[PDB]
Design a protein around this ligand. Structure first.
Ligand code: CDL
Lengths: 74, 28
């Protein structure tokens, strides 16, 4: 019947929308890889920043190294 | 003794109304 043939033709009318739904599915699996790569980036540029900023991103945990040199002058 | 066949006549129907009877079908 022509009615049946019409519904079969229309079954694939929303190709473009289904490709967009594919985009979402794949990008949701891939986007978490930004965290490992992000930690390493900050890890690399941390020593090139000022001392004042290095103590802020760590909540006062980080401090200058104490190796026993360059102490105050009497 | 052949069986007695019932008649089913041809009828013209509105296409849009017959589409309300097609089973649901999804490909996507
Ligand atoms: C069962 C088995 C058990 C076995 C036994 C146990 C096993 C384990 C035992 C292990 C013991 C230790 C072993 C030793 C390890 C360490 C030593 C070591 O290795 O040192 C390295 C050693 C020397 O080390 P070093 O450089 O002297 O170390 C100096 C320090 O790094 C000094 O660094 P720094 O001072 O410059 O910077 C430090 C700074 C660095 O700081 C930073 O960079 C960033 C700081 C700011 C971070 C801001 C974060 C903001 C967001 C916070 C979010 C919070 C959420 C809270 C949620 C709460 C929920 C309730 O960090 C801090 O200040 C401290 C951090 C405090 C803040 C707390 C937050 C931390 C970050 C958290 C991130 C998120 C984590 C969770 C993620 C997942 C969930 C989301 O180097 C060598 O030996 C080099 C040898 C030569 C190597 C040659 C390699 C190959 C060369 C050829 C290459 C070409 C060929 C290719 C080869 C490829 C091969 C693969």
């Amino acid at each position: 019947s022509r009615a049946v043939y019409a519904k079969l033709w229309a079954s694939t009318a929303q190709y473009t929308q289904r490709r967009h739904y594919a985009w979402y599915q794949i990008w949701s699996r891939v986007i978490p890889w930004s965290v490992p790569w992000g930690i390493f980036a900050m890890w690399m540029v941390f020593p090139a920043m000022p001392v004042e900023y290095r103590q802020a991103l760590t909540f006062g945990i980080w401090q200058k190294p104490n190796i026993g040199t360059h102490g105050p002058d009497p | 003794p052949a069986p007695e066949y019932r008649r089913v006549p041809f009828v013209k129907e509105d296409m849009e109304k017959v589409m309300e009877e097609v089973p649901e079908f999804k490909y996507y």
